[PDB]
């Protein structure tokens, strides 16, 4: 899916039972494969330390007649991954009601014991997990396609800072370009 536009398209559909998971990834904005080639992720790979809160914006790209609720949760890294929507309702979360405003922002707060986390990941400065769950369902009228699309956007907040310049582990060369 990485060799097409299918990589950006988070699929949702009407469900048979509620509380299933939509997606999930570790909050490693310079090391995780989901976030390290984004525009925020590429700047952080020039640096060794990062600090601050982040903004995950979501965008429902389905039909205007389709409704839905979602729970997007952030978990601090102590207990492990949340295993259900009951496990995810205990951390920092937001319930998003899909309506006339197509977008919602989950603000990931800086909950750390150090003032800086590392860009290349380690176990001392682990930042936690981001998961999304069906709060209710997708309910549509007839004559509408089943699968819809959600787009996820990342950006930094106004308390974000980076530190300790380095070379990025993304560009390589074996000889001089002639």
């Amino acid at each position: 899916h990485v060799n097409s536009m299918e990589a950006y398209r988070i699929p949702v559909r009407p469900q048979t039972s509620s509380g299933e998971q939509v997606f999930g990834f570790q909050l490693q904005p310079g090391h995780d494969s989901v976030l390290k080639h984004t525009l925020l992720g590429e700047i952080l790979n020039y640096y060794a330390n990062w600090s601050g809160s982040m903004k995950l914006t979501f965008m429902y790209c389905g039909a205007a007649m389709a409704t839905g609720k979602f729970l997007i949760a952030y978990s601090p890294p102590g207990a492990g991954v949340p295993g259900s929507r009951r496990d995810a309702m205990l951390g920092t979360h937001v319930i998003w009601d899909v309506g006339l405003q197509s977008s919602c922002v989950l603000c990931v707060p800086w909950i750390s014991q150090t003032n800086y986390r590392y860009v290349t990941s380690d176990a001392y400065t682990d930042a936690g997990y981001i998961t999304c769950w069906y709060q209710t369902s997708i309910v549509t009228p007839p004559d509408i396609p089943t699968t819809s699309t959600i787009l996820c956007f990342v950006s930094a907040c106004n308390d974000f800072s980076v530190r300790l310049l380095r070379d990025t582990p993304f560009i390589t060369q074996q000889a001089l370009f002639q």
Partner: protein
Amino acid sequence: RAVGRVADTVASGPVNTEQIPALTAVETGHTSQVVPSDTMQTRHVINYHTRSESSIENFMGRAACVYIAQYATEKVNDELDRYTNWEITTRQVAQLRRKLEMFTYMRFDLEITFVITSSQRTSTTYASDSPPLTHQVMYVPPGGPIPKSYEDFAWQTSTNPSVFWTEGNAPPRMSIPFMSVGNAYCNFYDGWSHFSQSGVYGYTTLNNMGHLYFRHVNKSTAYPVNSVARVYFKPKHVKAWVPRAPRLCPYLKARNVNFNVQGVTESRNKITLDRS
């Protein structure tokens, strides 16, 4: 609060309002300015962090090797000749090229530093006694008379800027002002060189910076010696405009932006996480 210092977060309590800071519209082109104080209860934190390392002068102001020039005290062929040259460019190395190509137009002064090192060529004998080698790095502006050989008259450098350096001392260094005939250095040029939309496509037509000629000013050695001169560019007094997307694909050539098609990121096996 000082310039360059990040913002504090304010103490926020519970809400039940008709205000909706979490709900927005990406379709407007607008990035939402949501603070953690808007969507959850926070405490008052006095943040003392600074954006020092992230400035354009601090991100760019480190010297990076841009060319490795090779020349000898005895000619093998015209690649290992007595002298060599280099058309001045920033696109042959990949580390500095990716940093400059994050912007469309830049405007900076330069510091050029040379790390020249010699080595004795492989021979059947090495036992000699030679005086210390001295090198010349002459800059030729675009359109000047270039050295066509060793022992040339063009190395008289009466109006071209030259530098001389004996091995053993500190590395040579000079400063270069902003040299473009426009108002900024163009990292990208979406166009052609001829008015009929033909010729050369790309940024190559906007790069006329001249050549840099290297030699040994010593006449001879007892046994041949190969030299290598590394060229280090550090940009200072940097302005930059129109920030570009970072490059995904590695480079193939120095005069093109040509690439091989690659995926947008590295993969994983499924879209969820599955533990407790």
